[PDB]
Amino acid sequence: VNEASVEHFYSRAGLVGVVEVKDSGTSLDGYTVWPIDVMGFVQQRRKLELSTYMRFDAEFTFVSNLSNSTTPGMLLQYMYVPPGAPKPDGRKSYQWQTATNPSVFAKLSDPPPQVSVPFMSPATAYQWFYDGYPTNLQYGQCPNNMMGHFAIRTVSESTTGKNVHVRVYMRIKHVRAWVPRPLRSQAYMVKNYPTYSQTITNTATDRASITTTD
Amino acid sequence: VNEASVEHFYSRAGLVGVVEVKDSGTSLDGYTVWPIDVMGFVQQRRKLELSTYMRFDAEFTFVSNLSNSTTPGMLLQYMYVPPGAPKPDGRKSYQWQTATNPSVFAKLSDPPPQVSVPFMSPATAYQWFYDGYPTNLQYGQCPNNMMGHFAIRTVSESTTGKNVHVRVYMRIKHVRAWVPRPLRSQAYMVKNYPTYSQTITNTATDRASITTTD
Amino acid sequence: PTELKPGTNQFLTTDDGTSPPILPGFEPTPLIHIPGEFTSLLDLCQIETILEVNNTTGTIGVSRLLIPVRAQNNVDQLCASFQVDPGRNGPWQSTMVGQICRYYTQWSGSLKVTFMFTGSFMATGKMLIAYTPPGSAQPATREAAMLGTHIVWDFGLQSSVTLVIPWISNTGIVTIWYQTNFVVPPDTPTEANIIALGAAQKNFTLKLCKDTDEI
Amino acid sequence: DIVMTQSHKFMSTSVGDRVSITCKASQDVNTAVAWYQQRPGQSPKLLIYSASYRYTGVPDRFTGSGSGTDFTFTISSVQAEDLAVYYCQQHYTTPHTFGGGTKLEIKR
Amino acid sequence: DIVMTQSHKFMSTSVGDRVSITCKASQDVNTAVAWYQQRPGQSPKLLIYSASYRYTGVPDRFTGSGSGTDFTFTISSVQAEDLAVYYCQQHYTTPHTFGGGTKLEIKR
Amino acid sequence: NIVLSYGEWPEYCPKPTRPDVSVNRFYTLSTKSWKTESTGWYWKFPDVLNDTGVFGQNAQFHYLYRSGFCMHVQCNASKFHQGALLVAAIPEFVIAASSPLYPDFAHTNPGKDGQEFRDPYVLDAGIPLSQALVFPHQWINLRTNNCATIIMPYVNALPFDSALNHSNFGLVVIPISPLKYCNGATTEVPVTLTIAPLNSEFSGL
Amino acid sequence: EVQLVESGGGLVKPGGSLKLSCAASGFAFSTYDMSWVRQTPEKRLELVAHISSGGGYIYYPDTVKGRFTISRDNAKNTLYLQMSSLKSEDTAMYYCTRQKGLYYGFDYWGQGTTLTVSS
Amino acid sequence: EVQLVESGGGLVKPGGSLKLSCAASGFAFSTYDMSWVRQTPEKRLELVAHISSGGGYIYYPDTVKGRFTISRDNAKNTLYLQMSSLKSEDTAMYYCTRQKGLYYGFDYWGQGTTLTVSS
């Protein structure tokens, strides 16, 4: 009876997205920027749309290693670009320092970094469904949900030969949900819009007749 | 209403300067001395000149690694030369030991060193604007603001082949500000003097007429 | 002066730990009262949602929600039947409790099933709704059904009726029999349609969260 | 800086032949190197960068290989259009640096 | 991707002889490689995979060895049935990649 | 008899003007005809009142407002007709497009004349209809009751928001069990609607 | 012993779509990963698509990525390949293969079916 | 397709200053880093200056450091080079190039313009 609570139901930490720097091979750029998308996986998306308005603090962790699952010591800079501030142009761009961009310097050898993001939205809660136009690409888009981009880079000075994979985990604390919504039957087409395929799929799997059971 | 406080406004830690030992290539010297300059970056300089007199304790951190962003264990000596004591001549100079020069011995493998400097000035507060001569190069120079040079060197005995970059972060605690000053419109020419370019730049971006808006 | 136990540096996926605030002295936008806050899924299981009892082949859509009933010129016949497992694939997939019981390995508790009658105001008849305990096959003919649990439901008087099933654990059958012919005065549509509504009672419980296959 | 020196200021060959040029690094550059095609009176084009990989559109007869401080740029089959000056680059670190140049010779 | 290049588009031998083919890797593949037998007008069969080990049922005269970026596939005794195209594979990472192919020549 | 949405009465939020007076009167929208073939309708107000009455004179010239609605739907049919309707008020109702790409603006804000569903089974929002009872709803069952009434308070994240952009919610009428009538009876059963905004406010003339 | 057969291959014009279906018998078909491989007229071989044994993981090379689709049915012992928007280079003969994992070598190969993209 | 043109180059006496301006069309010009390269009469090539795509980072070699200045305008699709205090060795032809990053090779090269420092 305590596992039906909305607080426990959203509890556990999960994989929000996998990003890669890849500075070694044909792509030498040497950093990456990962806009925070909680909807990333269609499984995590279908449990969120259950509720229309929800207010929660997030907590992150970055599990990193090379392509060998081998983790030698080499330094990484995890920066958090808050919503409304400019993004880094290139691996040396002066945005990588500033002041106001909170950063985390962690070697690979260390156990994974961890950090806690507060509630960033202007409105008193997030909205997963916003009717009406922000001011037809525009229809139903919340401008106020952006949580920031978590730009990453490897401090070591020039062109290491090592592509560094990294995984990003999220978990939701202190969650509070408002008016409920029925779960989605139809498959998803694209990320930001509900649009569903022409051909409809039934909700229940058919049987022989209105009568026969099993 | 708590993010407008002068204490929070100067809070966050930032990059005061980047120094390099470079004992490997054409320059074999093997150490460096970095006079503490809070004004180092024109961004941090424009927020300080907001206030004329201010009194604060500082706290430092040194994030170090090789040119690969690779951090093998090798020993470093971070020494702090207090204001008014002689500087090291060369990597073996007897100043590197003495007594009164507080030092920090930290391997690269360890997480970054950290240390807390007190308030060093004779006067009850720093002065970012000092009129009048200390006794025309002299005009407007505070002799009493020197905070010390943070000389660094790598203990390993002779000519390692490794140039070691190092970054230096500062954050300001317990700050107290006095009489306010308007922000600087004109661009900076040189470090220690206000001197501004001949050609003046307007403060506001012009429009078509006194009338039209947007 | 401490020692480190064997479990030091592991990162455990369900951590329930603490973490540094990334932006100290930041002020979230304060709350205001928003109506409707729901604190637990176990209230949603208690609201009734239309059930697909039809779900046959080629039934297209929005016609799958209702079971047809007409004058079949036969006194004792089996109108429709469906087993009572909420989680198991079948009719109950269209309910609510059907869906959020795909997210939990085990459930329990009583269920409630409600019927409506859409037919015209003049029509009259009798349906015998009979429930079979989970360890038995569905009845042969009503004389076997009326011996078990049942309620005779009459149109002209009672337009909706509720059948509480006693128990389910983690199977049972409810059938709908014609008790009498379907009788109507002249100039009236001859066939009605019955819709069903599933819901869970108060004591329904869930256990051991698990992610689902629906998608 | 880091100097990229090429061995031969000139090399001779004929059409249909196979020629391969080297490059030598002042220190360890890892795999970062690039090879350029400068035809007489023309802006030098990009061919092969970062050891083996070749830029989009470069014909397949142009190949390269190497690692560390020793590199090689291989022409499977020489043609007439292949006469021009070649250069090797170091993009491993700033500042970038180019080799002294190598000029082919087709002797008929 | 990672390119597996074979040195020789053709090799010649006779019955009873001994021939060995190489393969060259764009970068370090560890020991993962595989060698295939494609007879004319037939689905290419598996022979030797992961350096030395050979698949179940492959005759013993087929051998292979190597490590790192340099591999070898050795035929102790050539027979008549041995004429076909050979390929080397990289299963070290995704995506998999095949060599250009090598065709034997029996000259009588 | 009456369904208070989410168990609350709409109320003021303690200088915004309170019009009271003549924006508290009922408005009677045009009468939709429910045939045997017809499927669904929806409205999505604050929209429907933007043109009509003195209300639209407030909502067009004010930059912000707060409001709440009392809506009443009744269906006149003789006793020889059968069939049933589902009436539900679904907050934050965002529609979608079918694919073989966004919904045309005529489908987003229909106006006082409502709109027809393309796919009532999925609501044309993608969610199934069987579960749409989770929203505040009332059954109009032509052998029992002919009227359905709902009071929906002001539900939205911000205290105030503009009427020309964010449409606070929507309303659906879906004939779940189709209408049948014996020969000679009137062919169409009319459906009418009535809305009476409660506790409205406006600001920023 | 074992049989891998395929169908559907044949001449087609640019832009069209065609479903290659592979059927297997002689082994337990849910226990093996499967893949497609196409052989260009130069006999250069390259991968096409990959699916896990139980449908967990599906991999596409960068060229065919998003243009094709692969699926299998453990009940019908079939392997389906849905492929559209055919360009010039999409012509080659397609083999239906079998693996025990991601990195194992391909042990069996269907007899293969040709495909041709032309006006 | 793509066009990199330059201007301003020409004979000049020691000490003077000259603005080489490069103009581009045929691609999105704010998404690429840019650089200058000069080719000595011996055809020895060397770097001149570098700027990031959005103006974040600007790099100068040690020789020209402080003597030159580089800037770009994403609105005008131009790349400006302000260069003063010309010595003898500053004569060479200057190419206007394009990159995708710091360490990528230079894919395009302007036709180049000469520069000459003499009495």
Side-chain angles (χ1 to χ4, degrees):
Chain A
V1 298
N2 298 131
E3 289 181 349
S5 296
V6 64
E7 195 284 335
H8 175 277
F9 176 77
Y10 294 139
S11 174
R12 302 171 184 81
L15 175 63
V16 66
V18 176
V19 64
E20 178 180 0
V21 298
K22 60 189 182 71
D23 60 352
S24 181
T26 65
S27 295
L28 295 174
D29 56 355
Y31 66 91
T32 185
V33 297
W34 174 79
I36 285 173
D37 186 2
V38 182
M39 288 180 179
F41 292 164
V42 298
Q43 182 63 261
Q44 183 63 58
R45 178 178 175 172
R46 182 172 181 271
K47 290 165 59 182
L48 293 176
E49 287 181 348
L50 170 64
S51 63
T52 297
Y53 303 141
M54 65 187 288
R55 177 179 177 85
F56 58 85
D57 293 344
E59 179 181 1
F60 289 96
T61 297
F62 304 95
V63 176
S64 176
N65 59 343
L66 297 178
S67 294
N68 296 338
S69 298
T70 300
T71 177
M74 67 180 286
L75 185 64
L76 289 173
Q77 182 181 358
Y78 304 96
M79 179 175 72
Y80 171 75
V81 173
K87 291 182 295 297
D89 294 343
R91 73 166 68 197
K92 302 302 285 186
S93 300
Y94 70 89
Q95 291 82 358
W96 287 98
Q97 54 195 22
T98 64
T100 68
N101 290 342
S103 64
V104 177
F105 288 91
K107 290 183 170 72
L108 292 176
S109 299
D110 290 344
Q114 191 171 358
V115 69
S116 175
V117 176
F119 176 85
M120 300 300 293
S121 179
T124 64
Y126 293 94
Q127 285 181 329
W128 306 116
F129 293 93
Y130 178 83
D131 188 5
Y133 300 83
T135 62
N136 291 131
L137 278 69
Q138 299 302 321
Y139 175 75
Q141 297 305 319
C142 296
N144 61 346
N145 288 340
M146 291 182 286
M147 298 175 71
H149 296 78
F150 274 103
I152 299 169
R153 80 185 178 98
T154 179
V155 171
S156 185
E157 190 278 331
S158 291
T159 304
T160 59
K162 271 69 180 180
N163 293 340
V164 175
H165 301 288
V166 57
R167 301 175 183 273
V168 176
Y169 290 92
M170 177 187 283
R171 62 181 297 270
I172 294 100
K173 295 187 299 296
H174 302 168
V175 59
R176 295 174 60 85
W178 287 285
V179 298
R181 183 64 59 89
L183 278 69
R184 180 173 175 83
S185 292
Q186 292 300 321
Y188 288 91
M189 290 291 103
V190 68
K191 293 178 179 178
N192 295 129
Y193 300 94
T195 64
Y196 64 92
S197 64
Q198 189 67 66
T199 296
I200 308 301
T201 183
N202 289 339
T203 301
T205 61
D206 290 343
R207 59 183 180 187
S209 65
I210 189 65
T211 296
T212 61
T213 62
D214 180 64
Chain B
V1 298
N2 298 131
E3 289 181 349
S5 296
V6 64
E7 195 284 335
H8 175 277
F9 176 77
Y10 294 139
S11 174
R12 302 171 184 81
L15 175 63
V16 66
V18 176
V19 64
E20 178 180 0
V21 298
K22 60 189 182 71
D23 60 352
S24 181
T26 65
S27 295
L28 295 174
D29 56 355
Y31 66 91
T32 185
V33 297
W34 174 79
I36 285 173
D37 186 2
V38 182
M39 288 180 179
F41 292 164
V42 298
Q43 182 63 261
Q44 183 63 58
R45 178 178 175 172
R46 182 172 181 271
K47 290 165 59 182
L48 293 176
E49 287 181 348
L50 170 64
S51 63
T52 297
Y53 303 141
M54 65 187 288
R55 177 179 177 85
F56 58 85
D57 293 344
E59 179 181 1
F60 289 96
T61 297
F62 304 95
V63 176
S64 176
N65 59 343
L66 297 178
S67 294
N68 296 338
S69 298
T70 300
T71 177
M74 67 180 286
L75 185 64
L76 289 173
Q77 182 181 358
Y78 304 96
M79 179 175 72
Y80 171 75
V81 173
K87 291 182 295 297
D89 294 343
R91 73 166 68 197
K92 302 302 285 186
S93 300
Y94 70 89
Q95 291 82 358
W96 287 98
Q97 54 195 22
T98 64
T100 68
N101 290 342
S103 64
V104 177
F105 288 91
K107 290 183 170 72
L108 292 176
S109 299
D110 290 344
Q114 191 171 358
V115 69
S116 175
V117 176
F119 176 85
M120 300 300 293
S121 179
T124 64
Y126 293 94
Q127 285 181 329
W128 306 116
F129 293 93
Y130 178 83
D131 188 5
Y133 300 83
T135 62
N136 291 131
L137 278 69
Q138 299 302 321
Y139 175 75
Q141 297 305 319
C142 296
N144 61 346
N145 288 340
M146 291 182 286
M147 298 175 71
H149 296 78
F150 274 103
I152 299 169
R153 80 185 178 98
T154 179
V155 171
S156 185
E157 190 278 331
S158 290
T159 304
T160 59
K162 271 69 180 180
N163 293 340
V164 175
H165 301 288
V166 57
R167 301 175 183 273
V168 176
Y169 290 92
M170 177 187 283
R171 62 181 297 270
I172 294 100
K173 295 187 299 296
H174 302 168
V175 59
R176 295 174 60 85
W178 287 285
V179 298
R181 183 64 59 89
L183 278 69
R184 180 173 175 83
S185 292
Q186 292 300 321
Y188 288 91
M189 290 291 103
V190 68
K191 293 178 179 178
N192 295 129
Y193 300 94
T195 64
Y196 64 92
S197 64
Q198 189 67 66
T199 296
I200 308 301
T201 183
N202 289 339
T203 301
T205 61
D206 290 343
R207 59 183 180 187
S209 65
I210 189 64
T211 296
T212 61
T213 62
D214 180 64
Chain C
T2 61
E3 298 177 351
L4 303 182
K5 295 295 183 292
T8 61
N9 299 343
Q10 60 174 15
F11 170 77
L12 178 58
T13 297
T14 62
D15 190 4
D16 189 4
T18 186
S19 296
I22 189 167
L23 291 170
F26 182 83
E27 295 305 321
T29 59
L31 286 172
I32 63 172
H33 181 64
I34 290 174
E37 180 179 2
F38 69 94
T39 186
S40 66
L41 300 180
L42 186 55
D43 65 8
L44 294 178
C45 295
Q46 297 181 341
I47 65 173
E48 66 285 6
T49 59
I50 296 169
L51 173 59
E52 293 180 349
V53 183
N54 192 333
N55 75 348
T56 51
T57 301
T59 314
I60 196 66
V62 78
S63 175
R64 295 171 70 87
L65 301 180
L66 52 80
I67 64 172
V69 56
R70 62 180 63 83
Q72 73 285 358
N73 69 44
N74 289 281
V75 173
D76 294 347
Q77 290 297 321
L78 178 60
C79 182
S81 66
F82 52 92
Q83 71 287 359
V84 190
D85 277 342
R88 192 176 182 85
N89 301 136
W92 287 85
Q93 292 178 337
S94 65
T95 59
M96 189 66 178
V97 60
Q99 288 297 324
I100 65 174
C101 289
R102 306 302 298 275
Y103 288 93
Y104 292 95
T105 294
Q106 292 179 333
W107 57 88
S108 175
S110 297
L111 300 174
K112 176 179 73 180
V113 172
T114 301
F115 296 96
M116 292 180 69
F117 181 81
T118 305
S120 65
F121 183 81
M122 295 294 110
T124 301
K126 288 181 176 296
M127 305 299 289
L128 173 61
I129 296 167
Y131 165 74
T132 297
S136 178
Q138 68 176 20
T141 59
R142 59 172 294 274
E143 294 86 357
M146 72 171 284
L147 296 176
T149 303
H150 63 79
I151 55 173
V152 293
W153 174 62
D154 185 3
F155 297 150
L157 302 176
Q158 192 69 60
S159 294
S160 65
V161 66
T162 296
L163 188 148
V164 177
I165 65 167
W167 185 261
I168 287 299
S169 179
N170 191 342
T171 298
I173 292 174
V174 51
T175 62
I176 297 170
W177 297 96
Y178 291 99
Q179 180 57 58
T180 59
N181 191 342
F182 180 83
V183 175
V184 293
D187 288 343
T188 300
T190 308
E191 64 281 4
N193 295 284
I194 294 174
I195 58 177
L197 306 177
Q201 292 293 100
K202 306 306 287 184
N203 53 347
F204 191 84
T205 62
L206 298 179
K207 183 178 178 182
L208 195 140
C209 184
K210 173 181 68 67
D211 288 346
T212 186
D213 290 345
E214 294 299 323
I215 196 68
Chain D
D1 294 347
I2 298 168
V3 177
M4 301 304 293
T5 300
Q6 294 181 336
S7 296
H8 299 84
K9 264 64 181 179
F10 299 98
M11 287 181 178
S12 295
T13 187
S14 296
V15 176
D17 293 343
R18 178 177 182 169
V19 64
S20 297
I21 301 171
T22 185
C23 186
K24 187 70 180 297
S26 177
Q27 70 180 25
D28 177 68
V29 295
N30 185 340
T31 59
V33 63
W35 294 91
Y36 292 143
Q37 181 77 262
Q38 186 175 1
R39 295 179 67 85
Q42 189 63 259
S43 296
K45 297 181 182 299
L46 169 63
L47 289 175
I48 291 173
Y49 69 95
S50 297
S52 297
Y53 298 96
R54 60 181 177 273
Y55 180 79
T56 300
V58 171
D60 288 345
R61 70 182 184 277
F62 297 157
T63 58
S65 66
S67 65
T69 188
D70 293 343
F71 293 147
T72 299
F73 174 78
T74 296
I75 306 301
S76 63
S77 175
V78 177
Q79 292 182 338
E81 65 184 344
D82 296 342
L83 177 63
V85 180
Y86 288 134
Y87 296 95
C88 51
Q89 177 175 354
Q90 178 182 0
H91 55 283
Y92 170 73
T93 55
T94 61
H96 304 286
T97 302
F98 291 159
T102 300
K103 182 178 178 180
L104 295 177
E105 298 301 321
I106 296 99
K107 184 61 174 172
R108 198 169 316 277
Chain E
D1 294 347
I2 298 168
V3 177
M4 301 304 293
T5 300
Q6 294 181 336
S7 296
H8 299 84
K9 264 64 181 179
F10 299 98
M11 287 181 178
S12 295
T13 187
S14 296
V15 176
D17 293 343
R18 178 177 182 169
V19 64
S20 297
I21 301 171
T22 185
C23 186
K24 187 70 180 297
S26 177
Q27 70 180 25
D28 177 68
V29 295
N30 185 340
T31 59
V33 63
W35 294 91
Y36 292 143
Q37 181 77 262
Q38 186 175 1
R39 295 179 67 85
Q42 189 63 259
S43 296
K45 297 181 182 299
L46 169 63
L47 289 175
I48 291 173
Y49 69 95
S50 297
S52 297
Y53 298 96
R54 60 181 177 273
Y55 180 79
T56 300
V58 171
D60 288 345
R61 70 182 184 277
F62 297 157
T63 58
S65 66
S67 65
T69 188
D70 293 343
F71 293 147
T72 299
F73 174 78
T74 296
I75 306 301
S76 63
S77 175
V78 177
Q79 292 182 338
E81 65 184 344
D82 296 342
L83 177 63
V85 180
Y86 288 134
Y87 296 95
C88 51
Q89 177 175 354
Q90 178 182 0
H91 55 283
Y92 170 73
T93 55
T94 61
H96 304 286
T97 302
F98 291 159
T102 300
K103 182 178 178 180
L104 295 177
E105 298 301 321
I106 296 99
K107 184 61 174 172
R108 198 169 316 277
Chain F
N1 191 29
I2 288 173
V3 176
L4 276 66
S5 174
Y6 299 133
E8 294 184 352
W9 287 97
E11 65 183 343
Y12 297 139
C13 56
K15 296 175 181 177
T17 183
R18 296 175 177 82
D20 192 68
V21 188
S22 296
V23 301
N24 195 30
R25 61 182 294 273
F26 300 92
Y27 298 93
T28 301
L29 277 63
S30 65
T31 297
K32 291 292 188 291
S33 295
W34 161 48
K35 292 173 61 65
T36 187
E37 183 177 0
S38 179
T39 176
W41 288 275
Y42 67 92
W43 279 270
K44 292 176 68 67
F45 39 81
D47 181 9
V48 298
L49 295 173
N50 286 337
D51 294 347
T52 59
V54 63
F55 184 88
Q57 294 300 320
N58 286 336
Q60 288 177 332
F61 296 101
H62 287 75
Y63 180 73
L64 298 176
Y65 86 95
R66 183 182 186 85
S67 178
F69 286 91
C70 175
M71 60 195 86
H72 179 63
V73 174
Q74 62 178 16
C75 183
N76 293 129
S78 63
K79 291 183 172 71
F80 292 155
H81 297 81
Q82 69 178 23
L85 297 174
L86 175 64
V87 171
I90 173 172
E92 297 300 323
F93 181 70
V94 171
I95 64 175
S98 67
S99 69
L101 177 61
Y102 310 129
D104 183 3
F105 180 78
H107 295 81
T108 58
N109 295 341
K112 63 180 68 179
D113 57 353
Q115 188 66 54
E116 296 299 323
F117 286 98
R118 187 179 66 258
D119 287 343
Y121 183 81
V122 294
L123 291 179
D124 196 6
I127 61 177
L129 189 147
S130 302
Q131 295 172 333
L133 274 65
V134 65
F135 301 107
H137 62 285
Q138 191 71 59
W139 286 93
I140 294 169
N141 188 340
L142 289 177
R143 66 171 295 171
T144 297
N145 58 342
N146 293 284
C147 55
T149 299
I150 294 172
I151 289 98
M152 176 67 73
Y154 175 79
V155 54
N156 187 341
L158 301 171
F160 293 160
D161 190 356
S162 64
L164 278 67
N165 295 340
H166 183 194
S167 299
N168 290 334
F169 65 91
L171 177 66
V172 293
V173 172
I174 299 169
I176 177 169
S177 178
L179 175 138
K180 287 187 295 296
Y181 55 87
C182 184
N183 187 340
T186 300
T187 303
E188 295 182 351
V189 175
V191 175
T192 188
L193 182 144
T194 299
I195 54 176
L198 271 66
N199 294 133
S200 63
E201 292 179 351
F202 290 91
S203 176
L205 184 61
Chain G
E1 182 177 2
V2 59
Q3 292 174 334
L4 290 171
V5 296
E6 63 280 358
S7 298
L11 172 61
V12 65
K13 61 183 65 181
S17 63
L18 180 61
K19 289 182 67 66
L20 296 170
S21 64
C22 179
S25 295
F27 61 87
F29 180 78
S30 64
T31 59
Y32 293 128
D33 295 346
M34 302 297 288
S35 179
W36 292 97
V37 176
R38 64 180 181 188
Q39 188 169 357
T40 56
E42 301 82 357
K43 291 178 178 177
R44 292 285 296 173
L45 290 167
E46 63 186 344
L47 186 66
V48 179
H50 178 65
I51 186 169
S52 66
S53 65
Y57 179 71
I58 292 171
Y59 172 76
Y60 296 135
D62 183 67
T63 59
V64 302
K65 189 170 181 291
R67 186 168 65 255
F68 297 169
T69 299
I70 182 169
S71 62
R72 67 194 299 269
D73 183 4
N74 297 338
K76 299 301 183 181
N77 292 277
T78 60
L79 178 63
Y80 301 140
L81 175 60
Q82 170 58 261
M83 64 187 289
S84 65
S85 177
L86 298 178
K87 295 176 180 177
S88 175
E89 294 83 358
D90 292 343
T91 183
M93 75 177 290
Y94 288 78
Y95 298 93
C96 177
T97 181
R98 183 176 69 85
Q99 290 177 330
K100 295 177 179 178
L102 287 177
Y103 298 135
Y104 293 128
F106 303 90
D107 66 351
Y108 283 99
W109 293 77
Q111 59 183 19
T113 186
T114 185
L115 178 61
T116 302
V117 175
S118 180
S119 308
Chain H
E1 182 177 2
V2 59
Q3 292 174 334
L4 290 171
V5 296
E6 63 280 358
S7 298
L11 172 61
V12 65
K13 61 183 65 181
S17 63
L18 180 61
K19 289 182 67 66
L20 296 170
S21 64
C22 179
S25 295
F27 61 87
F29 180 78
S30 64
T31 59
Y32 293 128
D33 295 346
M34 302 297 288
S35 179
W36 292 97
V37 176
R38 64 180 181 188
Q39 188 169 357
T40 56
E42 301 82 357
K43 291 178 178 177
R44 292 285 296 173
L45 290 167
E46 63 186 344
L47 186 66
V48 179
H50 178 65
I51 186 169
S52 66
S53 65
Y57 179 71
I58 292 171
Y59 172 76
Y60 296 135
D62 183 67
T63 59
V64 302
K65 189 170 181 291
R67 186 168 65 255
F68 297 169
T69 299
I70 182 169
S71 62
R72 67 194 299 269
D73 183 4
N74 297 338
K76 299 301 183 181
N77 292 277
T78 60
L79 178 63
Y80 301 140
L81 175 60
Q82 170 58 261
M83 64 187 289
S84 65
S85 177
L86 298 178
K87 295 176 180 177
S88 175
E89 294 83 358
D90 292 343
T91 183
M93 75 177 290
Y94 288 78
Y95 298 93
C96 177
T97 181
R98 183 176 69 85
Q99 290 177 330
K100 295 177 179 178
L102 287 177
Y103 298 135
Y104 293 128
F106 303 90
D107 66 351
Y108 283 99
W109 293 77
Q111 59 183 19
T113 186
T114 185
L115 178 61
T116 302
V117 175
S118 180
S119 308

